[PDB]
Design a protein around this ligand. Sequence first.
Ligand code: MG
Ligand code: MG
Ligand code: MG
Ligand code: MG
Ligand code: MG
Ligand code: MG
Ligand code: MG
Ligand code: MG
Ligand code: MG
Ligand code: MG
Ligand code: MG
Ligand code: MG
Ligand code: MG
Ligand code: MG
Ligand code: MG
Ligand code: MG
Ligand code: MG
Ligand code: MG
Ligand code: MG
Ligand code: MG
Ligand code: MG
Ligand code: MG
Ligand code: MG
Ligand code: MG
Ligand code: MG
Lengths: 149, 77
Amino acid sequence: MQVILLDKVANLGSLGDQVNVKAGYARNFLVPQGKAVPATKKNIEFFEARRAELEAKLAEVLAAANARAEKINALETVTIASKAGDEGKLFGSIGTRDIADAVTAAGVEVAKSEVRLPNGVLRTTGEHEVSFQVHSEVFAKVIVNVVAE
Amino acid sequence: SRVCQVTGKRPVTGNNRSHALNATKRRFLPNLHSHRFWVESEKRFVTLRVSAKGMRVIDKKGIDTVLAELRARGEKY
RNA sequence: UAAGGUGAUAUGAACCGUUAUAACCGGCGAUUUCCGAAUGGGGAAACCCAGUGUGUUUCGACACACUAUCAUUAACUGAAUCCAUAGGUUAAUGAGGCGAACCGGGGGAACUGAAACAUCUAAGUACCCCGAGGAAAAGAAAUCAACCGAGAUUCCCCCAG
RNA sequence: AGGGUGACAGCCCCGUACACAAAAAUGCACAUGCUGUGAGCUCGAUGAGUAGGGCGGGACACGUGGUAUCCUGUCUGAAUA
RNA sequence: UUUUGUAUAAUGGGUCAGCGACUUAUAUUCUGUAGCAAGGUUAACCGAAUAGGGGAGCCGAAGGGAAACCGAGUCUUAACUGGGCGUUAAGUUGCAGGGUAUAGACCCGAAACCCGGUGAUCUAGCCAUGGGCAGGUUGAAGGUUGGGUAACACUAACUGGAGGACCGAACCGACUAAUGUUGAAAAAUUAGCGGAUGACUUGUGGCUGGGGGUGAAAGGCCAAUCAAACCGGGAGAUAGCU
RNA sequence: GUUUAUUAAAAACACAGCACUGUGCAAACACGAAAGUGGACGUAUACGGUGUGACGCCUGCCCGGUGCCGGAAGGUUAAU
RNA sequence: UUGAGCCUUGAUGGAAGUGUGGACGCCAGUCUGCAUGGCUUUAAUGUUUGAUGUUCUAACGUUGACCCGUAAUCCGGGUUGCGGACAGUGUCUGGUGGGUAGUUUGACUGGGGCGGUC
RNA sequence: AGCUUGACUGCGAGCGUGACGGCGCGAGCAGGUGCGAAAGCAGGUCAUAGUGAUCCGGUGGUUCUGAAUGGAAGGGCCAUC
Ligand SMILES: [Mg+2]
Ligand SMILES: [Mg+2]
Ligand SMILES: [Mg+2]
Ligand SMILES: [Mg+2]
Ligand SMILES: [Mg+2]
Ligand SMILES: [Mg+2]
Ligand SMILES: [Mg+2]
Ligand SMILES: [Mg+2]
Ligand SMILES: [Mg+2]
Ligand SMILES: [Mg+2]
Ligand SMILES: [Mg+2]
Ligand SMILES: [Mg+2]
Ligand SMILES: [Mg+2]
Ligand SMILES: [Mg+2]
Ligand SMILES: [Mg+2]
Ligand SMILES: [Mg+2]
Ligand SMILES: [Mg+2]
Ligand SMILES: [Mg+2]
Ligand SMILES: [Mg+2]
Ligand SMILES: [Mg+2]
Ligand SMILES: [Mg+2]
Ligand SMILES: [Mg+2]
Ligand SMILES: [Mg+2]
Ligand SMILES: [Mg+2]
Ligand SMILES: [Mg+2]
């Protein structure tokens, strides 16, 4: 009585791992009450065709837009800027919709503040290349041109 | 009828044989148990009078298949 | 088929026949009370008592048919529990009991033999029990052989007391 | 051949050898029709709580023996040309 | 007939007639007999059917040794001066007979063991439902009233109607004797006898079944029988006995 | 009161009474391979087993043997 | 909780001063950690493997109560309560076991038994 | 009393005594041994009791056997329990 698992399950559980439990626990509780299944060999592939068509399939299906920054490897046209101030230095900040303004016509248009650098955002030269939230892994690269008027 | 619904197992006859080697007619008879099985395929407890082994069989072949027999054999369940 | 006939003890009576419906023989039909598996219920076999449908210039009542159980199927119904199962009625099919031996299986003695007796024997006999056929069962190698080969099963003669 | 006929019958009677016969119902053969039914080729697949094993019994001419082979009540349990 | 021995007062037989016990099958050996003879003979089956075919096989012509093996020899033992068993006599297949073996094995006969049935119409116990006990005695408790006590106690009449209570027919039993004992009767008759409102008695129907029932217990009773019923089967049990 | 129906009716059996011993109820015990059932529609003032056998006065010693009851050390000890 | 193995972080194989429990410590040491201050002898966990104990519930028991099939003291399904991996049963196994069963329980013998003998 | 292991191994003409199973006596042969200068004597004890068939099984030896073949198990043979 080996059986493979469905839900978690205390001292063995793991949503699909290969256990070997006492027959009773199974034909008396685990199965007929949905939680496991006889390891009927028919099954050890039926529930291994997933461990491959998933943990090696849908974990690769993620990789189709590398870095997401594809042909944007040469920065983007500077429509406007991101502001300035302090007669030479910097003074103004980025409203909850003001890092786009410059790169405001490139990719798809949005407007949200998934802030990444919890600092007072350094006030100097201008053009900088950090990262921003493009996804739970990758990054992106562009610059920032000010406006003289 | 001490008879295992899934394996056919009924009682058999034999001798006892002492040290003296004395034959005495006797019976071996199955370890039966009549257990309440869950089906899910039928949302119900079909409750067969099985012999362990009979049990071990269900535990392998599966109940829908064991109940598949019987149905196909005549038996009630 | 026919010139004789109506079985016997068993005559007699009243009759039927003789060239084709006397009788006799044979094929196929009809009729086939009651009891008996017996099956509408019951029951001390050959008896008692029903329900439902019918049916009568006298449509009271009394005659006629159908109503057992079980199994497979089907239709219609339908709980605890709302679906669903269970249950319920109805219908069509089938079974049921009897009977020689042979046959397959389930179970299985003892006297007796061993010059007592217990392993052993009698014996897988007698006997009970279930099932089937004209036969049954068995059967086309995970069989033998022996370094050559054979080629299912069944039965007979040998091998061999 | 056999039987009967007032005693022992080839030739008295019934028979016998032989040669023939059925409107009907059936048996078995074939030749056909009906309902089925599947045929042939290629490419596959090739019988697991099974084989084996411990325990207890039973079958094998074999009485557990040094005892292979088979069946299985109980507990277990493979390989896959 | 049995016996050391039977006229024996030991068995058996009333008498006649009919019946009534050493068989059959297959092996196996020996004798007789017949064929063929270092050979003899076929089985099943085939069949042109008592022929013929079939020589599968059996016995014999070669023994010794546990055997490997050797071989008119061989085994024994290192080997035997030797020793044991063998070489020197024909077989085989029918037929009849004499024995044996396996079968009921010359015929009849147990008490019994085992299997499967039939019996609680007799009887034991129990269940249901019904019936019966003439007549005559004794006179418990309780009650009433008197007398009694301080009041109870106590006490007398009467009332009452208990009891595996008394006597005694019916009914149920069965202690004694005689008769009977090829009976009137396979357990009685007669004269006496115990119980007789009770653990009583009886009708109808029911339940319990054989290593079982039931038993106020005798091993009693279970259909004229019971230390294990009756019928049928195993079964021609076995019988070193008569 | 019962008994050997058919050779024994008794001093035998039974008896009320006594004791011992089992049983907490799905009781013990009993029929029964089981199911079912009696015990009991009872429940320890009950139900079974055993012996004694109204009643009166009583019922002593013995636990080695046998039997039975209890014992969570050790010795010995089965399948496995 | 507990016997034993493996994996590990602490024992055998960013200095000096103002400060602490346990200890075979060669008999009189030094340590093993505790604060700070410009492959083999040792303790806890993760565990793997058996033993013991609590509890759980989900097999299994219910000769409690109820609902339905059902006008039903059977049965079955369902609900609920109590119990519970115990009890019970199958196989195997040691013990007890005249309750039952099959038998044995010699011969000689101045009858038999006893004695005696073989 | 001295030296010793003849309380040897294979055999055995020929006799006894038994229904039989068996038991007994035995010179002589071969090998090899002890004692004796030698002839020679020794196959237990003056003789006659001091015992237990067969089966099963154990132990040593021994290829005799050994189920396809080679081995092995088991069987035989001799020794002994
Ligand atoms: Mg009728
Ligand atoms: Mg009827
Ligand atoms: Mg006997
Ligand atoms: Mg005998
Ligand atoms: Mg057939
Ligand atoms: Mg295959
Ligand atoms: Mg005399
Ligand atoms: Mg004289
Ligand atoms: Mg005389
Ligand atoms: Mg009566
Ligand atoms: Mg009286
Ligand atoms: Mg009288
Ligand atoms: Mg009187
Ligand atoms: Mg007596
Ligand atoms: Mg009688
Ligand atoms: Mg009889
Ligand atoms: Mg017989
Ligand atoms: Mg006889
Ligand atoms: Mg009296
Ligand atoms: Mg009498
Ligand atoms: Mg008398
Ligand atoms: Mg009592
Ligand atoms: Mg007494
Ligand atoms: Mg006895
Ligand atoms: Mg004698």
